[PDB]
């Protein structure tokens, strides 16, 4: 499958292989029965991987086409989500957005994502200027911050991505929260950009 092919290209490149193994070994290391990993360290290693390995390797792993579950599960596992994505606490998306916005880089990366993956009702791709690449890059640029998005399950073609948060407990800001969340979950520009990558 394309996701296996992507892992191969990475492992056969010295720099990709090193930076891949580094995030894998940190993110996969259990601390105690109650703590799945050192999350902060895992996120840092993820950031380094996406910052210091070219997109030709990196996007191919993250956005590889799948026809079956085996491939889609591999794709879902790219960021090692049981460490980097999931948590026993599922925060409110607007609270999580607040946490992201205290970090200079997360704030800027989220803003890039909102701008570059903005759904247009006027363009053939639903992306601004039909620029798929800038949307994909902005998606990838959020991994390892406190707005880390991921594939929600191992659906092969029915792709749904989201941060680990919900809009329950929003009080009177429920509409605001769900609109924010839909930039990830229900965005035709992002959908089309990922699908067009192959």
């Amino acid at each position: 499958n394309h996701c296996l092919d992507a892992a191969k290209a990475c492992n056969l490149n010295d720099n990709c292989k090193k930076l891949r193994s580094s995030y894998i070994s940190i993110c996969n290391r259990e601390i105690s029965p109650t703590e799945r990993c050192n999350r902060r360290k895992c996120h840092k290693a993820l950031r380094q991987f996406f910052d210091r390995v070219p997109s030709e390797y990196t996007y191919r792993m993250l956005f590889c086409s799948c026809q079956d579950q085996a491939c889609a599960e591999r794709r879902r596992q790219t960021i090692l989500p049981s460490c980097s994505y999931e948590d026993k606490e599922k925060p409110n998306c607007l609270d999580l957005r607040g946490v992201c916005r205290t970090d200079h880089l997360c704030r800027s990366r989220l803003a890039d994502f909102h701008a570059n993956c903005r759904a247009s009702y006027q363009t053939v791709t639903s992306c601004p200027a039909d620029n798929y690449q800038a949307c994909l890059g902005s998606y990838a640029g959020m991994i390892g911050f406190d707005m880390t998005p991921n594939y929600v399950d191992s659906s092969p073609t029915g792709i749904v991505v989201s941060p680990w948060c919900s809009c329950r407990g929003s009080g009177n800001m429920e509409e605001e929260c769900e609109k924010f969340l839909r930039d990830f979950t229900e965005n035709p520009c992002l959908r089309n950009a990922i699908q067009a990558f192959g």
């Binding site: 056969l12 599960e73 596992q77």
Partner: protein, 98 residues
């Protein structure tokens, strides 16, 4: 006769028989080739003593071996049950006639 040095091979992790059920590929690097440098004085002395039956009956190497002197730090992969593994010192990183 190619001298002792690094060699490379693309391999499937599952092919190595190490208990990992993974179709991932790694670049496997190893040490092979000839050690044709002039003998050390140690090895020359040792050969002579061996030949004169002066040594205690035992395996005695009086000639260098092409072997790794450093190893790969780590390499990782996802297996067929969706679990990640990291393996240390799988491949050679440097070779010498030791």
């Amino acid at each position: 006769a190619r001298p002792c040095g690094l060699r490379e091979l693309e391999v499937r992790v599952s092919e190595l028989g190490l208990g990992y059920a993974s179709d991932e590929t790694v670049l496997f690097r190893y040490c092979a080739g000839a050690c044709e440098a002039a003998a050390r004085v140690y090895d020359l002395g040792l050969r002579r003593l061996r030949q004169r039956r002066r040594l205690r009956r035992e395996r005695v190497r009086a000639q260098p071996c092409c072997r790794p002197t450093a190893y790969e730090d780590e390499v990782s992969f996802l297996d067929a049950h969706s679990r990640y593994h990291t393996v240390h010192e799988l491949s050679a990183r440097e070779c010498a006639c030791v």
